[PDB]
Design a protein around this ligand. Sequence first.
Ligand SMILES: O=C(O)c1ccc(NS(=O)(=O)c2ccc(N3C(=O)c4ccccc4C3=O)cc2)cc1
Ligand SMILES: *C(=O)CCCCCCCCCCCCC
Ligand SMILES: *C(=O)CCCCCCCCCCCCC
Lengths: 59, 269, 269, 59, 55, 55, 252, 252
Amino acid sequence: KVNSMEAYQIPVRSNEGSGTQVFGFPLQPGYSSVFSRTLLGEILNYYTHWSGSIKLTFM
Amino acid sequence: RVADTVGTGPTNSEAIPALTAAETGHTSQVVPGDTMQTRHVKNYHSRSESTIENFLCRSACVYFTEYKNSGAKRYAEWVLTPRQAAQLRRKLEFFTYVRFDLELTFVITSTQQPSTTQNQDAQILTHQIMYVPPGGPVPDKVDSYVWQTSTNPSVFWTEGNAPPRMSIPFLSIGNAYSNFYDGWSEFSRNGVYGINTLNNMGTLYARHVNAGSTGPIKSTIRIYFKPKHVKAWIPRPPRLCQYEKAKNVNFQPSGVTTTRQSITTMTNT
Amino acid sequence: RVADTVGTGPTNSEAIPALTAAETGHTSQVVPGDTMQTRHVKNYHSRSESTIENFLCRSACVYFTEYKNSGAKRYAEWVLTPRQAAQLRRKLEFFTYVRFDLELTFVITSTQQPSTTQNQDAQILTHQIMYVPPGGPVPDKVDSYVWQTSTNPSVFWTEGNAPPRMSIPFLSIGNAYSNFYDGWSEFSRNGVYGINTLNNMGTLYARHVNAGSTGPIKSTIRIYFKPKHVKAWIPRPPRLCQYEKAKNVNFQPSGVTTTRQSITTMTNT
Amino acid sequence: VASDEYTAGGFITCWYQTNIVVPADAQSSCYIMCFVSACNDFSVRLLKDTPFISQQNFF
Amino acid sequence: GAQVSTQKTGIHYTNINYYKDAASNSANRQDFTQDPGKFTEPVKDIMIKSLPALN
Amino acid sequence: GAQVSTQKTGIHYTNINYYKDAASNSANRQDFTQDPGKFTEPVKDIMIKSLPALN
Amino acid sequence: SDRARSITLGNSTITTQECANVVVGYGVWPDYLKDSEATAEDQPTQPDVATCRFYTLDSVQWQKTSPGWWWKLPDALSNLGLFGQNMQYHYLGRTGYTVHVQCNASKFHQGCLLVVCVPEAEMGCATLDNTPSSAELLGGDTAKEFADKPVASGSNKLVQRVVYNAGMGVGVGNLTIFPHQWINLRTNNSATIVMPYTNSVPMDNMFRHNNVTLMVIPFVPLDYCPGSTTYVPITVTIAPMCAEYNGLRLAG
Amino acid sequence: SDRARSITLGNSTITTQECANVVVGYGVWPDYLKDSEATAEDQPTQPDVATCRFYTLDSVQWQKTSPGWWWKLPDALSNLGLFGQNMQYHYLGRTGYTVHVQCNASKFHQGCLLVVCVPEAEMGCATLDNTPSSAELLGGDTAKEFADKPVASGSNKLVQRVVYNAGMGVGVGNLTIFPHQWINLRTNNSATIVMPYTNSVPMDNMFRHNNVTLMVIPFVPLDYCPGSTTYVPITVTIAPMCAEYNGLRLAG
Ligand SMILES: O=C(O)c1ccc(NS(=O)(=O)c2ccc(N3C(=O)c4ccccc4C3=O)cc2)cc1
Ligand SMILES: *C(=O)CCCCCCCCCCCCC
Ligand SMILES: *C(=O)CCCCCCCCCCCCC
């Protein structure tokens, strides 16, 4: 998926019931597979310490 | 720098800061008090380590060459570029255009080479490093007339002293150095691509000024670049692939990220 | 500082300063004039040697490692802690929480190693000591790309000069370093106990930058820590037992004091 | 920035609150894209080399 | 001709320039001005949070 | 920007700071404030010597 | 007069007839976290009178040979009341304590106890290349006991418990720099210490860090003649002070 | 514009794009108990942001034949969070609610729901000389369902559940004097009611009295053509408002 554009896409669909999970990943930029190569995450592998709030947007 | 959190109570309002349109190409200015109840916090944190003149202003080894006081390879030649070595190169390529003054520092070491010479007894070595601006004579041997240094900057250094250093101005003919060039130098659009003369800044030569010993000694000179007085414009995504060549942007296709088991798993593989 | 004795004459009073209750957890504030006739003395004594920034502010050897310019063990690795060596460690553990800036000083020496190499003739040695903050690349050999030092602090030192030194800020993520931790880092309360990440402060690497000689030379680097700008909170009883491990508080049970013949004898055994 | 269990971050998860509902002749499979950025109270500290660029020889 | 400036703290220091070239001077470490509004919010119309981004 | 302070005696010295970091400065040797009353007398009620500790 | 005391926190009230004053910490009384020392940006939970009130722990007999006892503070109240139900739903919290130890005996009995609240009392292991397990350090309102003889070194996850080293490798007679009182049976029958929150971080998780440890140690053994009561209990009572919690999540 | 809404309570935030305003009670917004209406003399516990925040209950499918559902308010949150841990340690408490019901469907679906909060909805029994058991009235965050046909009379402790009498013996079309909104699928996808505390006593025990009952009743059935989504859930989200508790005791 990493060798395609399918990495960036998160599946959601019509399914029976609700309360099923869509995704989960841990908060830890600059370590996690998900966040280490993001633009935020690569200004954060040059640093040992980090502080503050992070905002995720979904579209 | 860092801003202070402001306290917030309950809401029930026609305001909708959380909802946004990300199609507009605008990063939302939502702060935590918008989406939840927060307390007032005083922050005393600073953004002083993430200045561009902190990030780029540390010495970094760019190259090293070797030369001997006997046989072939009597001197070392190097065309000054910060693109031979990966680590410095990657940092500068967070930007399209940069402008800075260098400080060169040289760590010159010498090592005795195996031989069957009886009764070696080195004298102290003195080394000459000669900076030659673009154009003009190039030494073709140790003991040419080019090492006179009538108008070429040069330093002499005897062993067991502090590393030499010298400052270099900003030497571009342009108003900034460019780290990327999407063109040809020829009007026909033939020949090498991505080659430009905005980043010329001469060649460096290094030799021994004496062979102290009867036996062979080989020296290694390491060049360190330290940007200072930096200004930078137009930021770019970091390099994702390993570099291949020093004159090209050529790459082997690399995956976006490393893998993991599922889209719900909380560990890396 | 030291207070002046005040003269006192005879008493016969309902005052009872000598009698007290020590069950209250209060140390009595009795002075000598209370219990006897004293003269007035002017004291000019000071308590300036017993300041915390005098007690802890002297260089102390914490560790030493060896490395060679040939064969195996080409470099030395050490994780910075003041807990390898007994004397410094004991002094800091008069307190629970401490906060200070380091000054590192390195005494680097070299010793010729026995060999059957004919016609040895060393050049001066240059050494590189590289500080690597927590995380990031670790050298796995002499001549890796990690010794470029593009963004890792590093010093170079040629023999027969003054010891290098550098200052380090207070690097804790907490508001003080802790010398004791009564917990686990895991929420399950499993794994190692007393392990915490408040006291991380990277790893130190050291190597030769050249092998000067044809024969083998082995170097020894000794690291000295000097606290400065110290603040300390919550005092603790001194360590009574010998230390066993550098990560644990583990001990062999030791008697309270050394013995003597009787409870009326005026000599030690 | 690096993995430590003393400075664990937490977990970010997503669930269906309600099913995806579509009419006939519209795809019942959709995607979400995620974005990440820092807030204005964010800061970083203590420079170090990045683990993400390497070389075996000069280029 | 000495400059006196404040140090980075959780006092002051003195500096004299010794050379006739301004490329010989020590690095500028204490410049902390910033403006993220070029790269965030480059939109022509002013976005107000607590109002629809698109009407 | 020099500080002039008194020396330890039974005169004065001059000091200039040369660096832009306040962790580069020499150690603070002459801070002599103290307060033993946190560790001695931590009791809530005020103890007066020359009066019973317990009535 | 000076020997009578009453302390009211929430529902609870304690009253003593023999009292040695109240020791207060390092001269610092419990307070709520300031907004100039805070790091966490959420609004705190402050339950008030549902957490901050006295809780009695189990009593333990004082015998002629008894070595001493210890309780590790947030994890000795972790199953009790809504104090225990706020620290498993929240990631963070900070609190001070008021510790009150009772022990009454006749005027024909003798003995002396040292009651200390020791910040970050990290304790050794019998085997020198292991560290203790969490089932050898933590009770849950049951007291752990010291020993009078060295713990043998096996392949143990046992604590090295000896009274004279205090399980920490220090002299036990030097534990008097920590906030303390003595219960001497011919004087007083109770001891009160008020601890403030001591840590190097403004709030901390309470299910993997114990920032205080109470220890009650006989220095003079219990002694009495035939015909007297032979069972003398020691009861410990502990009240939170200015408890806060932050970081609401699921239970666990 | 008028259709966008955001409600923030504690951690939680709800956002809707289609909204019919917010109905507020009888024009009374939740408030804390006054000291001129109070009877109990102890200091209240007011947990604040640990109780007063949105809790999602289990979803339930809306089918072409569905009769309706009900949840009895304090006893549908009794196992959830620290709301559930304050009402079993205290004898008393009082709270208002914000109830938010969600149900989204396409523009090719149709149907209509009535969402009512009914004070003291006492419900009949199938057998006329018995009263219902507490396992037929109370879910626990699972919804109880109405029936479309009369419940047969046996020797039952069953509820008499019929939609058209509403289980109370009244016309179902007259439930519009209670605070209410309609979810009509061609207009809006959510409904918000804010109830104040309604009782004839200033505080009351919450484990044997349910002072409100939410009911969601189809008046126009769900209908759609082949090719559309066949599963349409209805999610209920409920937040306490100004919760207080008094009378701290043991759990139970
Ligand atoms: O130590 C550093 O500062 C230093 C070490 C390695 C380095 N980058 S590298 O890609 O790992 C690299 C690794 C080895 C060599 N290299 C040699 O070791 C060598 C030996 C003899 C002739 C030529 C060379 C030569 O190109 C060049 C580069 C940069 C600097
Ligand atoms: C302004 O520059 C005058 C202030 C006093 C100067 C003291 C100068 C210190 C020693 C000389 C440095 C000269 C460098 C070329
Ligand atoms: C205040 O600092 C000015 C007082 C006179 C300064 C004399 C300076 C001595 C020589 C320069 C030291 C500079 C260190 C960077």
